[PDB]
Design an enzyme around this catalytic site. Structure first.
Site, PDB file in Angstrom:
ATOM      1  N   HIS A  69      35.808  37.671  41.477  1.00  0.00           N
ATOM      2  CA  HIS A  69      35.390  37.085  40.203  1.00  0.00           C
ATOM      3  C   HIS A  69      35.184  35.572  40.305  1.00  0.00           C
ATOM      4  O   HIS A  69      34.532  34.970  39.452  1.00  0.00           O
ATOM      5  CB  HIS A  69      36.349  37.455  39.060  1.00  0.00           C
TER       6      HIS A  69
ATOM      7  N   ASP B   3      38.997  43.414  43.319  1.00  0.00           N
ATOM      8  CA  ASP B   3      38.616  42.016  43.075  1.00  0.00           C
ATOM      9  C   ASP B   3      38.883  41.138  44.286  1.00  0.00           C
ATOM     10  O   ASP B   3      39.671  40.189  44.220  1.00  0.00           O
ATOM     11  CB  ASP B   3      39.368  41.506  41.842  1.00  0.00           C
TER      12      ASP B   3
ATOM     13  N   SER C  14      43.340  31.967  40.582  1.00  0.00           N
ATOM     14  CA  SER C  14      42.706  33.208  41.005  1.00  0.00           C
ATOM     15  C   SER C  14      42.275  33.109  42.460  1.00  0.00           C
ATOM     16  O   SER C  14      41.865  32.044  42.922  1.00  0.00           O
ATOM     17  CB  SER C  14      41.485  33.510  40.142  1.00  0.00           C
ATOM     18  N   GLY C  15      42.388  34.213  43.184  1.00  0.00           N
ATOM     19  CA  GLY C  15      41.994  34.230  44.574  1.00  0.00           C
ATOM     20  C   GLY C  15      43.106  33.768  45.489  1.00  0.00           C
ATOM     21  O   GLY C  15      43.034  33.973  46.702  1.00  0.00           O
TER      22      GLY C  15
END
Length: 228
Positions: A41, A89, A183-184
């Site tokens: 994402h 994801d 995120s990530g």
């Protein structure tokens, strides 16, 4: 990262900053000399943007001998990832050249065996994401130790209401949590990569909304195939 502290500088040499047009966008983790794993994402917006990876960093802005900005030769989102879901994801970024390794840049072992991390295990999450609800962004790497939450409880109606598949895991998120811009980033247990932070959920640090992480071991075949 909410409820954490500033990490020791360069003590997590696997930590990567995934950048879009020179600005921090997502966390990532160096999993091979030429490969960084992050969340799909992060890119599901980038379009024309220039995607790069900063390795060896503590401060995002300040001069450091070990800092190195890499172009990306290929961006490989998991083929089954989708903008409107938290599933699959994952994102692999191939660096323009193999990373220069040293005390401040080193890939981290990642879990290939598909077994859950035991509930209660304390794992480390690091990143440069927002550190409070006012949305202030830290300049230097932060981290926090979070206990793994059993998937059953994480799936409770007040929590994530059945959304946590066997491919996902959870950590408690009460005053401590990963946030926007985290995120990530990596969830690391006993020095092994186990999880990658998934989609930012609307409220950071809400006890009824445990942090959700993609289980790297569940995607080991996919990761290996890309790296090979």
């Amino acid at each position: 990262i909410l409820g954490g502290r500033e990490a020791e500088a360069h003590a997590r040499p696997y930590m990567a900053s995934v950048q879009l047009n020179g600005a921090h966008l997502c966390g990532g983790v160096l999993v091979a000399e030429q490969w960084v794993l992050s969340a799909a994402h992060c890119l599901e917006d980038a379009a024309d943007g220039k995607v790069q990876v900063l390795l060896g960093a503590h401060s995002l802005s300040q001069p450091e001998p070990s800092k190195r900005l890499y172009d990306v030769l290929r961006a490989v989102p998991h083929p089954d990832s989708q903008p409107d879901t938290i599933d699959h994801d994952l994102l692999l970024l191939q660096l323009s050249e193999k990373a220069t390794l040293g005390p401040a840049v080193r890939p981290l072992p990642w879990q290939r065996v598909d077994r859950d991390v035991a509930p209660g295990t304390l794992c480390d999450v690091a990143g440069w994401g927002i550190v409070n609800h006012a949305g202030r962004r830290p300049d230097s790497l932060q981290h926090v130790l979070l206990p793994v939450l059993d998937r059953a409880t994480c799936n409770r109606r007040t929590h994530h209401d059945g959304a946590i598949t066997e491919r996902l895991m959870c950590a408690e998120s009460n005053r401590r949590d990963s946030c926007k811009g985290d995120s990530g980033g990596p969830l690391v247990c006993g020095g092994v990569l186990e999880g990658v932070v998934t989609s930012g959920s609307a409220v950071c640090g809400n006890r009824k909304k445990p942090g959700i992480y993609t289980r790297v071991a569940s995607y080991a075949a996919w990761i290996d195939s890309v790296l090979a």
